[PDB]
Protein backbone atom coordinates (compact mmCIF):
# COMPACT_ATOMS: atom_id res chain seq x y z
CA UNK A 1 93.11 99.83 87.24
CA UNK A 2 93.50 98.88 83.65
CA UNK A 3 94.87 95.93 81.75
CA UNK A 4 97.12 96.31 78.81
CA UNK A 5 97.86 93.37 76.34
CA UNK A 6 101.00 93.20 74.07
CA UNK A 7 99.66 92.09 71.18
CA UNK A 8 103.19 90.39 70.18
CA UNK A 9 103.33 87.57 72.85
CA UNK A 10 100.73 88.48 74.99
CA UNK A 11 101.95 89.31 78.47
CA UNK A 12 99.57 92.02 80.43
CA UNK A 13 100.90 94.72 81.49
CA UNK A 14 98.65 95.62 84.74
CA UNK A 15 98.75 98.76 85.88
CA UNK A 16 97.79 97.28 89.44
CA UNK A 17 100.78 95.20 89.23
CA UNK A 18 103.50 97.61 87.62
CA UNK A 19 106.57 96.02 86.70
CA UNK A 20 108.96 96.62 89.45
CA UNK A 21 112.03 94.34 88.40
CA UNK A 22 112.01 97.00 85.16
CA UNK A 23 111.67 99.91 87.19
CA UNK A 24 107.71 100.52 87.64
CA UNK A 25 106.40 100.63 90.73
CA UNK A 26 102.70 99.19 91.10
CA UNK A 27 99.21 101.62 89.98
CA UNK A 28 101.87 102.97 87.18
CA UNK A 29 99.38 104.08 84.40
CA UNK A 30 100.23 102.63 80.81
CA UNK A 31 100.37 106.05 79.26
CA UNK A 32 102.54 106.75 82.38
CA UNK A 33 105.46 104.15 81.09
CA UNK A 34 108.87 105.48 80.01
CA UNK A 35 109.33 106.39 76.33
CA UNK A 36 111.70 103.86 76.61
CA UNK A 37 109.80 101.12 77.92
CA UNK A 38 108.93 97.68 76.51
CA UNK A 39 107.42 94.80 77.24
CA UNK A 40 109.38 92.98 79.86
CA UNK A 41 109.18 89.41 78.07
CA UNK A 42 109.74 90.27 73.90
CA UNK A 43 110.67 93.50 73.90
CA UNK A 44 107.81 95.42 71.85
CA UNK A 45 107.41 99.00 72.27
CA UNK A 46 104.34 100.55 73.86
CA UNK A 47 103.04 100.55 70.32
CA UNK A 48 102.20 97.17 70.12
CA UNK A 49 100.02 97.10 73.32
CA UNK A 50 96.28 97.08 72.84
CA UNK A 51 93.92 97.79 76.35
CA UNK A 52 91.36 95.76 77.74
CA UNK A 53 88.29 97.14 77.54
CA UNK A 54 85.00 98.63 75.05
């Protein structure tokens, strides 16, 4: 699946991975996240997150 990057402090959100201590269980799409959700480590909304790819 795809990789997200914050582009505040750079932590990856991988959709492989999920983030399970936040309440995402792994192969959770980004677009799939919470309206609420932020990044786990600074706190940016989805907004800031760029994806990995062309």
């Amino acid at each position: 699946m795809a990789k997200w990057v914050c582009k505040i402090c750079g932590y990856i959100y991988d959709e492989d991975a999920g983030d399970p201590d936040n309440g995402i269980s792994p192969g959770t799409k980004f677009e799939e996240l919470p309206d609420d959700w932020v990044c786990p480590i600074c706190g940016a909304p989805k907004s800031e997150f760029e994806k990995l790819e062309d």
